[PDB]
Amino acid sequence: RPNRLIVDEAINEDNSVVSLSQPKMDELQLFRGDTVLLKGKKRREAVCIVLSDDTCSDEKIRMNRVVRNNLRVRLGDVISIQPCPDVKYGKRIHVLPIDDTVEGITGNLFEVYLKPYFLEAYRPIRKGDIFLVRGGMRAVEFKVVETDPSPYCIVAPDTVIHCEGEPIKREDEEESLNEVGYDDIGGCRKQLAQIKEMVELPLRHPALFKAIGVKPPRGILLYGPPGTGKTLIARAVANETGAFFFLINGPEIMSKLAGESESNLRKAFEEAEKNAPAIIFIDELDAIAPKREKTHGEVERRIVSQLLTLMDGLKQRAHVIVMAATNRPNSIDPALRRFGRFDREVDIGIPDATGRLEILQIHTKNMKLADDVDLEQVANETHGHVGADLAALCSEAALQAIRKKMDLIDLEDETIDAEVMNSLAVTMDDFRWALSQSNPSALRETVVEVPQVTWEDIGGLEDVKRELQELVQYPVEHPDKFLKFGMTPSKGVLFYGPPGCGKTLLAKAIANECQANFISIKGPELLTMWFGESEANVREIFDKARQAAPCVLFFDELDSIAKARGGGGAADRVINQILTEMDGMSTKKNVFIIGATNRPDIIDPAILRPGRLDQLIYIPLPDEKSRVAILKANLRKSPVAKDVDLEFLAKMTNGFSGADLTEICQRACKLAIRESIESEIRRERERPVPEIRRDHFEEAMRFARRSVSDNDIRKYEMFAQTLQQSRGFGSFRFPS
Amino acid sequence: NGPEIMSKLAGESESNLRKAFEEAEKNAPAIIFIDELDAIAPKREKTHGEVERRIVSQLLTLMDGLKQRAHVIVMAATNRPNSIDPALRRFGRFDREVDIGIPDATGRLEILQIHTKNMKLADDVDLEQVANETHGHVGADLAALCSEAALQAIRKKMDLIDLEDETIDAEVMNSLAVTMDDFRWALSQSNPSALRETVVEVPQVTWEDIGGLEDVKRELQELVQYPVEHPDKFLKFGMTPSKGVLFYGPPGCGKTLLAKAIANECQANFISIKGPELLTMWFGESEANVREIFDKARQAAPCVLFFDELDSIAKARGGGGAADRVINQILTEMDGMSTKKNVFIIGATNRPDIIDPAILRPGRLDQLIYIPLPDEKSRVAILKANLRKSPVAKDVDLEFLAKMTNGFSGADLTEICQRACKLAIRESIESEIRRERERPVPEIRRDHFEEAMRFARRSVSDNDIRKYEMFAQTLQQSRGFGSFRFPS
Ligand SMILES: CN1CCC(NC(=O)OCC#Cc2c(F)cc(OCc3nnc(S[C@H]4C=CCCC4)n3-c3cccnc3)cc2F)CC1
Ligand SMILES: CN1CCC(NC(=O)OCC#Cc2c(F)cc(OCc3nnc(S[C@H]4C=CCCC4)n3-c3cccnc3)cc2F)CC1
Ligand SMILES: Nc1ncnc2c1ncn2[C@@H]1O[C@H](COP(=O)(O)OP(=O)(O)O)[C@@H](O)[C@H]1O
Ligand SMILES: Nc1ncnc2c1ncn2[C@@H]1O[C@H](COP(=O)(O)OP(=O)(O)O)[C@@H](O)[C@H]1O
Ligand SMILES: Nc1ncnc2c1ncn2[C@@H]1O[C@H](COP(=O)(O)OP(=O)(O)O)[C@@H](O)[C@H]1O
C-alpha cells in the first residue's frame, strides 16, 4: 500500500507520539490529533498520537526509540501504517515494570511517576510493547501485558494499572533503551548526520555494496577533545544502525604482552567479520598508532605497522566499518590517513552554544529540573566544556541536591524508594554550585559555533544586510546562474569602520542565517601567533575550517598585528600565512573568510586582491533611524518601561557607535539593578522596581561615551574614498 | 606492503623480504614494489633501535646484490626523497626519481573520467568546473569524490526504491544519473589530502587568453621557444641562450598570465612561487626550503619557474642594501640551475626599483621585459579575453570601453568585467526570486556595464607609471650609443 513510509529520528521527546507531515497526514486520513497505528518488521504494533511537524517531508515519519525498539525497526527502515479507530477505553490494563532496569528501586514506583505521564493526556496503550518513563533520576522501561482484547487501547481513569511487578527478564528481541542511541547525542547535529550518511548504507544494506562496484567507507577518524562523545557516538550509530559494536580500549592493546596484544587485535577484527556487519572502534588510535617517526621502541613500531597492514587488508568483507577516536589528526602517524584507512575525518569539536544546551537536556530528562532553572543561561555559562563535563555538571548538581536532602531525610540506608526522588527538584542553586565546582576540559581549543545572533539582533545597517544577503546567500542557493555568466562568487569580505559598530555581530548574523559554522579568530589570537612566531598554527585554524565546513571564518582586528608594530611595509608573518591560506581556500567555495578592520588604512594591500578579501563593505556609524533599532535590539531582553523615549535617545546621541549605545543601556541596567538591590536590602534591614525606569536612563546618560568621533570618522571615509575609486568615471554613458 | 616487513618478528620479516626477491627472480622478469620504502628504510642516522638499522642495511645489501638477473625492476614508493636515508639513492639502488606530484588542473579532470566511465554522469555535470574545484586533491581523493557522489545518488534513490534488499538488478543502476548536486555535496564533504605541497601544473592559459602585448609575446616566443627547437644554430654562434626573465611593470598587468601562457605554449610544467611563499620562507628563516622548490623544478623538468612578487621581501623590509636571505638563496639556486638549460626561471616585480642588483646578472635573470599598461588597442583584446566565457550581448561597445579607460591595467578591466557579471547575476537572481514570489535576462546587458563602470578602479596611475619608465630608462642604457654606425 502507498501508506508505508521511512522512519526518521523524532525531534520531540514525547513517547508513543508520531510526527508526520500535514500533506502526508491528510493523505493518510489523519486529523490534528488522530491516533495512527503502525506495523513493524516483526509481530508487534503500537498505536501512537499523530503530530503535525513542518520539519519533515511526507516519506520521513518521525519516531522515537521507544516506538522503534518495540516495532523492531532500526533508523532508516520501512514502516507499514494502517489506521483502525475504535473507542476501546482501557479496562484494568496490565502495565508491568518487568525488565532489568528495575534494580534497587522499590516502593510505589509503579504509580509515583506513572500518574503524571502514563495516566495523562489520554495517550494510547498497547500490550506486548515497552514504553519508557523518566522520573526520579531514573529511566524505567515499562512493559504492558493486557490492554483489553483489542490491538488498539487508550488510557482511561478505569485502567487501574494494578500492581503485579515482577523481576521477569527481558527478551533479546527488545533493545535496551538505557543503551545509547541517536537521542543520546545533542551537541552534534551536522557531525552526527555526517556519520549517519557515511555508515547507514554500508551497514543496513551490505548486499547493495556487494552487488554494485563501489568503495565502501571502511575507516572513520572521529577526532576531538577527550570527553566529547566520540565513543558515545560510535556506540550510538553502531548499535542503533548496526548490530555488533566492538570497543577495544586502545590502551588495552598497548598494554598486553606484545604477542597476546596483537592476538587480541587480530581476534577483534575476526569476531567483527565473523559474527555480522559490525563496527570496530579504536578509542585511542592516537595511543596505538602515534607518530612512527618520533617513536623510540620498535615493538611499538611493530604495533603501528601491524595495525596499518590490518587496515589495508580490511578492504575485504565489504561490511565492516572501523571507527577510530583521537584528540587531533596531526598527532597520528601520516599513514593512517591513506586511502581505505581512516580516509574520512568527521571532526566533532567542542559543543557550541545551544549544542551544550542540547547536551544538558539529554542528562536532565531522566532527572528533574524543578521550574526555576535557566538551562539557556547555564548553557551560555558552560563555555569550554566537552559533553563529559556537562554529564558531570548534570551529575554534580543532582548529587548536590541529593546530599542536601540527606540532612532532611536522616538515617536512610535502603533503596531510598522512588517517591522522594520524584520529590527531588534540582534548582538553580545546585546547578550554580556544580558549575562553580566543574572545571572546563577543552577551553583553549578554538570553538566552532553556530551563533545565536540573528538579523533581529542587528540594529540598522539595512543596506549592509542586503549586500551581505545578496553576496553570500545568493551563490549558495543559485549556483547555476552564477555558473552561466562565468564568474566565481566573491569569497571574503573586509568589514571596515569605527570600532564597536557591529562587524562581529554582522558576521555572526550571516553565519546564523545560512546555518553555517562560525570560527572567530580575534586579535588576541593573531597577536599571540605573531609574537611567539607561531604562524604555523594559522594553518591549523584553516584546517579546522576545512573540517567544519561550511564556515564563516572571521578575522576580528585584522589590523591588530599592524597596530602592535606602530601602525615597515606591513605584510607581517601571521598576515602572510593568512594570505597563503586564503589563496589555498579560494578554491574551497564552502567557507567564507570575512575579515574586520577598525583601522583599515594600516593594512596589508595584499589582503585586497581577487581570491583574497576583494569585496569591501563599510560599516558606518548608526544614523538617527539605526540607533533606534540598535537600542531596541540591545534592550529586548531587558525589561524597559514603555515611558522611556528610545527614539529620542537616538536623536541625542550623534556619533555614538553600537558599542556606545550598548554601554549606555548596560549602565542603565546596572543602575536599575543597583536601585533594586538597595531597596531590597533596605526593606530587609527595615522589615520594589519592576522595570528600568526613566531616571535610570537619565543617570546612565551622564556617562555617555563616544569612543569614535571627529577625525577618526574621517579616516574611514578617507579609506572609503581611496577604495571607492570613482575616479571621475561616474555617470558614464555608452553611445547609442 | 612495507609495514608488513616492518611488522613481522624480525627474522621472519627478513625471510619474507628475501623470499619476495627470490620469487621475483625465480618466476619470470617481474617488478618488486616497496609501497613504504620510507617506512622500511628511514634515515638511518636518526634511528634509535638497531634491528631497524639491520633492516635498512639488509635492504641496502639486497638492492646492491640485485644487480644480477638483468630483468628484475624494483619500484619503491615514498612521500619525499629527502626523508629516505641517503644510501637508497646510490648507483643501482633507486638511482632514478620519477616524482609523481599532485594532479594538476586538467589532470584531475583526466582522473575523474577514469572513475566516472564505469559510472554515469547524467548531462548537467561540469567536469571541468569540478576539476578546477578539486584543488589540492590527490588521485585518491578524486576516487573518493567520484565514490561519495555516486553513494550520495544511491542513498537518495534508496528512499525512492524502498525495501530493496537484493542484488538490486542492473536496470535501476542504469537509470541512476549522478548530477551536479551529488558532486557538489561530495566536493563539500571531501577534504584535500595534499594541499600545502607546491603544485606543479601545465597551465590552461594560452596566447588567446593574453590580451595585447604582441611585442612582448613575440620576444617571449623568440627567446624561450627558439632555443628548445633550434639548438644547433645556437651552438654554432657560440652563445648560451638566456634563461630567466624579470617581468617588470604595473601590478595586475599580465606577468603571471604571460608566464602561464609561455608554459602552456611549450607544454612545460609551471611552478609559481608567489610572494606569500617567499615572505613565509623569509620570516620563519626557512630559506632551506627554497632549495626544495628548485629540487621540485629539477624533478618536474621542463619547468617555467615563476617568482611572483620578487620584490615582496624588499617591500616587507620598507622598500639596507637589499640582498635578503630568501633572495640570496634564490640567487645561489639560480647559479646552480644556470647549467640545467631545461628550466626557465621567469621572475616578476611590481616595483623593480627596490630589487637586489645581483638578480640582474648573466646566468641569473639577465633579460628584462617590460610589461606596459595596455593601450587603446590592447584593452580591446584584454576585455574580449576576459569576457569570452561570459555571455556578453553584442550591443555593448568594448572598443569604446577601451577608449574611455586610459590608465587601466589588465586587473582593472578584469574587475570591471567581473563587476558587470556580478550586476548581471544580481539582476537575474532578483528577477527570478521576484517571479517566484509573484508566480529573464539571457546575457550581460548594456546597463550592467553602465553601472559597473561607475566603480571603475585605476590601481596604478600617474607617478607610479613613471617609476617603471624610470626603471626602463636606467635599464634601457642607450647611453648615447643609439644610431651608431661603423665606417665603411
Ligand atoms: C571568468 N573565468 C571563467 C571561468 C571560471 N568561471 C566559471 O565557469 O565558474 C563560475 C562559478 C561558480 C560557483 C562556485 F565556485 C561555488 C559555488 O557555490 C556557492 C557556495 N556554497 N557555499 C559557499 S560558502 C558559504 C556557505 C554560507 C555561509 C558562509 C559560507 N558558496 C559560496 C558563497 C559565496 C562565495 N563563494 C562561494 C557556486 C558557484 F556558482 C573562472 C572565471
Ligand atoms: C661564448 N662562450 C663560448 C662557449 C660556450 N657556448 C657554447 O658553445 O654553447 C652554446 C649553447 C647552447 C644551448 C644550451 F645550453 C641549451 C639548449 O637547449 C635549449 C633548451 N631546452 N629547454 C630549455 S628550457 C625551456 C623548455 C620550454 C619551456 C620553458 C623552459 N632550453 C632553453 C631555452 C631558453 C634558454 N635556455 C635553455 C640549447 C642550446 F643551444 C659558452 C659561451
Ligand atoms: N554530545 C553529547 N551529548 C550527550 N552526552 C555527551 C556528549 N558528548 C559526551 N557526552 C557524555 O560524555 C561521556 C563521554 O564518554 P565517552 O564517549 O566514553 O568518552 P569520549 O567522549 O572521550 O569518547 C559519555 O558518557 C556521554 O554521556
Ligand atoms: N548594529 C547593531 N545592532 C545591535 N547591536 C550592536 C550593533 N552594533 C554593535 N552592537 C553591539 O555592540 C557590542 C559589541 O560590538 P562589536 O561586534 O564588538 O563591534 P565591532 O564589530 O565594530 O567591534 C555587541 O554586544 C552588540 O550588541
Ligand atoms: N594582457 C592581458 N590579457 C588578458 N587578461 C589580463 C591581461 N593582463 C591581466 N589580465 C587579467 O588580470 C588578472 C590578474 O592578472 P595578474 O597575472 O595578477 O597580473 P600581474 O602579473 O601584473 O600581477 C587575470 O585574471 C587576467 O585575466
Numbering used by the authors:
A (entry chain A): 22 to 588, 594 to 713, 727 to 775
B (entry chain B): 270 to 588, 594 to 713, 727 to 775
Authors' account:
The molecular mechanism of p97 ATPase has been extensively studied with a variety of methods, including X-ray crystallography, nuclear magnetic resonance (NMR) spectroscopy, and single-particle cryogenic electron microscopy (cryo-EM). These approaches have revealed a dynamic molecular machine with three distinct functional domains: an NTD and two ATPase domains, termed D1 and D229–31, each harboring conserved Walker A and B motifs typically associated with ATP binding and hydrolysis. This homohexamer structure appears as two concentric rings, formed by the D1 and D2 domains, that create a central pore capable of binding protein and peptide substrates for segregation or degradation.
Several p97 complexes, including its mutants, have been reported to show a dodecameric form. Since we did not find an asymmetric form of the oligomers among our three-dimensional (3D) reconstructions, we enforced symmetrization with C6 and D6 symmetries to the final densities of the hexamer and dodecamer, respectively. The final reconstructions reach resolutions of 3.23 Å and 3.33 Å for hexamer and dodecamer, respectively. As shown in the previous studies, the dodecamer is formed by the two opposite D2 rings packing against each other via the α2 M helix and part of the C-terminal tail. Although the physiological function of the p97 dodecameric form is still not well understood, it has been suggested to be inactive due to its higher order structure that may limit domain movements. NSC799462 binds at the interface between the D1 and D2 domains of the adjacent p97 monomers.
